[PDB]
Amino acid sequence: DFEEKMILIRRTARMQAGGRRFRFGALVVVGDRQGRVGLGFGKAPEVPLAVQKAGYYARRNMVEVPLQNGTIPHEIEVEFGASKIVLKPAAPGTGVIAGAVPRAILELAGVTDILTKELGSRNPINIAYATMEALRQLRTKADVERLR
RNA sequence: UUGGAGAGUUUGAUCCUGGCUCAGGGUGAACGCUGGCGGCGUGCCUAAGACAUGCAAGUCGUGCGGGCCGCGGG
Ligand SMILES: [Mg+2]
Ligand SMILES: [Mg+2]
Ligand SMILES: [Mg+2]
Ligand SMILES: [Mg+2]
Ligand SMILES: [Mg+2]
Ligand SMILES: [Mg+2]
Ligand SMILES: [Mg+2]
Ligand SMILES: [Mg+2]
Ligand SMILES: [Mg+2]
Ligand SMILES: [Mg+2]
Ligand SMILES: [Mg+2]
Ligand SMILES: [Mg+2]
Ligand SMILES: [Mg+2]
Ligand SMILES: [Mg+2]
Ligand SMILES: [Mg+2]
Missing domain, CATH: 3.30.230.10 (Ribosomal Protein S5; domain 2)
Known part of the structure; x- marks a missing residue:
């Protein structure tokens, strides 16, 4: 099928009384090497979910x-x-x-x-x-x- | 149409602005550590400061008169 590449992983942070609490952002492009590409940004409370979530949106935003x-x-x-x-x-x-x-x-x-x-x-x-x-x-x- | 890559760093995190920094290539180089050979380049960028010694512009006797020395006799 299509092929994936993780361009960007990054950790963000929000604040509350107690300290910083983190999120994770995954910027992943998915392509066909023959004219289909998609880009997706997936944010989730842990790295695998985001990396997997972004690949989802990517497959629904193709050019x-x-x-x-x-x-x-x-x-x-x-x-x-x-x-x-x-x-x-x-x-x-x-x-x-x-x-x-x-x-x-x-x-x-x-x-x-x-x-x-x-x-x-x-x-x-x-x-x-x-x-x-x-x-x-x-x-x-x-x-x-x-x-x- | 033969040609164009970016990254680090301001924040708890974000986007922007912006400076600093880095990776490349180059040098008549110098410095440290190390040093086998060959080729072709190339080597006072500072005091156009000062210079020992030799050498770097002479040649024609087919222009001319001569002193010397060597060779043939008068
Ligand atoms: Mg078209
Ligand atoms: Mg930046
Ligand atoms: Mg800093
Ligand atoms: Mg500030
Ligand atoms: Mg910080
Ligand atoms: Mg922008
Ligand atoms: Mg603009
Ligand atoms: Mg900028
Ligand atoms: Mg910058
Ligand atoms: Mg030797
Ligand atoms: Mg000089
Ligand atoms: Mg000198
Ligand atoms: Mg002086
Ligand atoms: Mg001479
Ligand atoms: Mg003479």
Whole structure:
């Protein structure tokens, strides 16, 4: 079936009379390596539940992302509030050029060759959301002349 | 169209802002520890401070008159 990757685990904290009491946040992308990716954020009182909870939501938030010989059809920039991802198509023999967060998303979508660059807040979460919305806005020639 | 990776650190925790710091590459280098050979580079970045000694620009007797020495006789 699909394939999972844990980009982010982190411990948060709330306060009460007595001290700090913790939660856990799991940021996990799930892909098909052939054009299906999803991103999910799952928060739970212990690490396994969250890691498992996020993979659930991930499977219910997928994007088409239409590959073209392993690369995306056009350059794209998306801002998710102070976070900014740039994606540029790249020829075959180049590789996936991305930091760890967008890499896990592109590599699970079957992107084999792309140029990326994060800008502004490189906050992993918001960068991950902005990478997903970037893929969500990918158009093809058949997509655009149908629109026109 | 051959080209673009980020991370640590302000909070109990969050998002943002922002500075500091790090991973890379480079040097006519220097310093420490260590040191086998070969090739090709390359070596006063400071006092354009001061310098012993030798050498780094001479050559033509097919321009000219001469002193010397050596070779053939007058
Ligand atoms: Mg499409
Ligand atoms: Mg902005
Ligand atoms: Mg942001
Ligand atoms: Mg910043
Ligand atoms: Mg940061
Ligand atoms: Mg500190
Ligand atoms: Mg403060
Ligand atoms: Mg602290
Ligand atoms: Mg910073
Ligand atoms: Mg020897
Ligand atoms: Mg000098
Ligand atoms: Mg000197
Ligand atoms: Mg002086
Ligand atoms: Mg001489
Ligand atoms: Mg002479």
